[PDB]
Each structure stands twice: as structure tokens, then as C-alpha cells.
């Protein structure tokens, strides 16, 4: 079920990568170079970036020439293993034991940042976690309102901004101070949503993590970057930017339901070394799924 969510999320990627099975029917030692040329094309087509594609393909070539892989089916399994190792190389939320844990959620418009926060709150509440929401998306009035609805839905308290021109850092500080005083397990912090990254946005995010750190030592525990999965490889420059400016601990890739760009998941993880912790594969609250690298590899290749 949970597992079969992901099978649908990447159904189109799986259909497209299936051409690899057909190609491998015609593999033999002599045909290795031509077969690998075609495998390379298929990976690129599904948004495996140039860097990982060459890495995967050349490792297969080596292992074929060395005699480690002696059949099409062995080659296909080595392909799956090579991808799994690029992925899994922790995807769970690392909240520790000190209370409160602090989670910031960041990302640009269209990525489902505020919505994912709501769905995460719903998930945490399910496991019996005491959650305070903090509406630090001060740029988007509609986000703050949406979050209040989410707070009502999930049964969380929410700290909201006073006014249309509140400082996010101020709202977050107030939230974490309160979470600490009132014995909350987790403070879930939203942050400002913009059309695209810019100097103001990053300055703002830096100010935010600095303020929460002032109140609780080590905060935030997690800074999760939410990305529209449909942007494929075009997400990498942006994730790279968030990471070197702010310091991201986990990715959430959304809107993935039905995608043909499954390769980008592997590409973004291996390039930046940040784990994908959740994937959004639907509009339902329970369509925010923790990421399972093995099931993903099976979903796109099998
Ligand atoms: Mg700094």
C-alpha cells in the first residue's frame, strides 16, 4: 500500500526505463559497447544527470570486462545496485531527545512547502507527538491562513504573526520559546515563500535559524527543503544554493505522482549528499511518504 503509492508516483518513469530490459536481451560480450551506449541514452532520458549516468555506465563496462557480470539479468541487477548505493550512502528525521526538537521547512513557490508542513504535522501527531506550529511564512498571507486550517485539522496549536509585516525570525523565536516553556516535543516552523531565491530570502532564512538557535542549543534539528519533483534536474542549482547559504539536512520532493523524471531523485541526492526524507505522491494528507531507497529503486526499475 504505502509501498504501492511510490509505484504509481513513478509509473511513467518505470515504463520508460523498461526499454533497458529489452536492450539487455541483445547483450553479449562483443555487443557491450553498443548496449551501453543505449543504456546511457535511456538513463539520460529519465533525468539521470550526466555525472551519475557516466558513473553507472562505466562501472557496468568495467564489471563486464572483468567478468563479474556475465548475463543481461546480472547486468540489470548491478545497475539497480549501483543506483541504490548512490542513494543510500539517514533518511529519517533526526530529532534526538532534547526538547523541543525544531524543524524548519523552506522552499520556493509551487513546491508545496506549506502544504507539506501540514501533512508532516498530521503525520507526527499520529505517532503521538506534541507539535507546535509556527507560521513564519510572513511573505505569503495565504500560507499563514492555510497553516491555521492545517492546525485546526491536525489538532495543533499555532503561533501566528501579528500583522502583514512581521519578521519571520521574530515569529519563530516566539514559537520556540513557547514550545520549550510548554513542554512541546516539536516546533514545526514555516518560512517565507518566494517565486525564486534571492538575496532577501537567504538573508531571511539565515536570520531565522540564528534566532531559533539562540533559544534552544543546536536548533534547528532539521532544515527540510521542499522541491517540486517535476522540475527534474532543474532543482539542483536551487538545492545547491539553499545548501551552501543555509545548510539543508533533508529534501522533500513533491507532486511526484505520475512523473517521468525519476532519475532526478538519484541525481540530486548523489550530487549534494542530502537525503530525500519524504516524497509527495498525491493530494491526500497521507500522500506524504517517508522515502525508502530500496522501494524507489524497485519502483523505477522493476
Ligand atoms: Mg551565517
Swiss-Prot record:
<dbReference type="GO" id="GO:0016887">
    <property type="term" value="F:ATP hydrolysis activity"/>
</dbReference>
<dbReference type="GO" id="GO:0009570">
    <property type="term" value="C:chloroplast stroma"/>
</dbReference>
<comment type="function">
    <text>Signal recognition particle receptor protein. Binds GTP specifically. The GTPase activity is inhibited by the N-terminus of the protein until binding to the thylakoid membrane. Activates the GTPase activity of FFC/cpSRP54 when bound to the cpSRP complex. Required for light-harvesting chlorophyll a/b-binding protein (LHCP) integration into thylakoids. Might be also functionally linked to the Sec translocation machinery.</text>
</comment>
<keyword id="KW-0809">Transit peptide</keyword>
<feature type="binding site">
    <location>
        <begin position="254"/>
        <end position="257"/>
    </location>
    <ligand>
        <name>GTP</name>
    </ligand>
</feature>
<dbReference type="GO" id="GO:0009535">
    <property type="term" value="C:chloroplast thylakoid membrane"/>
</dbReference>
<protein>
    <recommendedName>
        <fullName>Cell division protein FtsY homolog, chloroplastic</fullName>
    </recommendedName>
</protein>
<feature type="binding site">
    <location>
        <begin position="107"/>
        <end position="114"/>
    </location>
    <ligand>
        <name>GTP</name>
    </ligand>
</feature>
<feature type="binding site">
    <location>
        <begin position="190"/>
        <end position="194"/>
    </location>
    <ligand>
        <name>GTP</name>
    </ligand>
</feature>
<keyword id="KW-0547">Nucleotide-binding</keyword>
<dbReference type="GO" id="GO:0046872">
    <property type="term" value="F:metal ion binding"/>
</dbReference>
<keyword id="KW-0150">Chloroplast</keyword>
<comment type="subunit">
    <text>Monomer. Interacts with FFC/cpSRP54, a component of the cpSRP complex, composed of a FFC/cpSRP54 monomer and a CAO/cpSRP43 dimer. The complex with FFC/cpSRP54 is formed when both proteins are bound with GTP.</text>
</comment>
<keyword id="KW-0934">Plastid</keyword>
<dbReference type="GO" id="GO:0006614">
    <property type="term" value="P:SRP-dependent cotranslational protein targeting to membrane"/>
</dbReference>
<keyword id="KW-0479">Metal-binding</keyword>
<keyword id="KW-0793">Thylakoid</keyword>
<comment type="similarity">
    <text>Belongs to the GTP-binding SRP family.</text>
</comment>
<dbReference type="GO" id="GO:0005525">
    <property type="term" value="F:GTP binding"/>
</dbReference>
<keyword id="KW-0342">GTP-binding</keyword>
<keyword id="KW-0472">Membrane</keyword>
<keyword id="KW-0675">Receptor</keyword>
Amino acid at each position: 500500500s504505502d509501498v504501492e503509492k511510490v509505484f504509481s508516483g513513478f509509473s511513467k518513469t518505470r515504463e520508460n526505463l523498461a526499454v533497458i530490459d529489452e536492450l539487455l536481451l541483445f547483450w553479449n560480450l562483443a555487443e557491450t559497447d553498443r548496449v551501453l551506449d543505449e543504456l546511457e541514452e535511456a538513463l539520460l532520458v529519465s533525468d539521470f544527470g550526466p555525472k551519475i549516468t557516466v558513473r553507472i555506465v562505466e562501472r557496468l563496462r568495467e564489471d563486464i570486462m572483468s567478468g563479474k557480470l556475465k548475463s543481461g539479468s546480472e547486468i540489470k541487477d548491478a545497475l539497480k545496485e549501483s543506483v541504490l548505493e548512490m542513494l543510500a550512502k539517514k533518511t529519517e528525521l533526526q530529532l534526538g531527545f532534547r526538547k523541543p526538537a525544531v524543524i524548519m521547512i523552506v522552499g520556493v513557490n509551487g513546491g508545496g512547502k506549506t502544504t507539506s508542513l501540514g501533512k508532516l504535522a498530521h503525520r507526527l501527531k499520529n505517532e503521538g507527538t506534541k507539535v507546535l506550529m509556527a507560521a513564519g511564512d510572513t511573505f505569503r498571507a495565504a500560507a499563514s491562513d492555510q497553516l491555521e486550517i492545517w492546525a485546526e485539522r491536525t489538532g495543533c496549536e499555532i503561533v501566528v504573526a501579528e500583522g502583514d509585516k512581521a519578521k519571520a525570525a521574530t515569529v519563530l523565536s516566539k514559537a520556540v520559546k513557547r514550545g520549550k516553556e510548554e513542554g512541546y516535543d516539536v516546533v514545526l516552523c514555516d518560512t517565507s515563500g518566494r517565486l525564486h531565491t534571492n538575496y532577501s530570502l537567504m538573508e531571511e532564512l539565515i536570520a531565522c535559524k540564528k534566532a531559533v538557535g539562540k533559544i534552544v542549543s543546536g536548533a534547528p534539528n532539521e532544515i527540510l527543503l521542499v522541491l517540486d519533483g517535476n522540475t527534474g534536474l532543474n532543482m539542483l542549482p536551487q538545492a545547491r544554493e539553499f545548501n551552501e547559504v543555509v545548510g539543508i539536512t533533508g529534501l522533500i520532493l513533491t507532486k511526484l505522482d505520475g512523473s517521468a523524471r525519476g532519475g532526478c531523485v538519484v541525481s540530486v541526492v548523489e550530487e549534494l549528499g542530502i537525503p530525500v526524507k519524504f516524497i509527495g505522491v498525491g493530494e491526500a494528507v497521507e500522500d506524504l511518504q517517508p522515502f525508502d531507497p530500496e522501494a524507489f529503486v524497485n519502483a523505477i526499475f522493476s
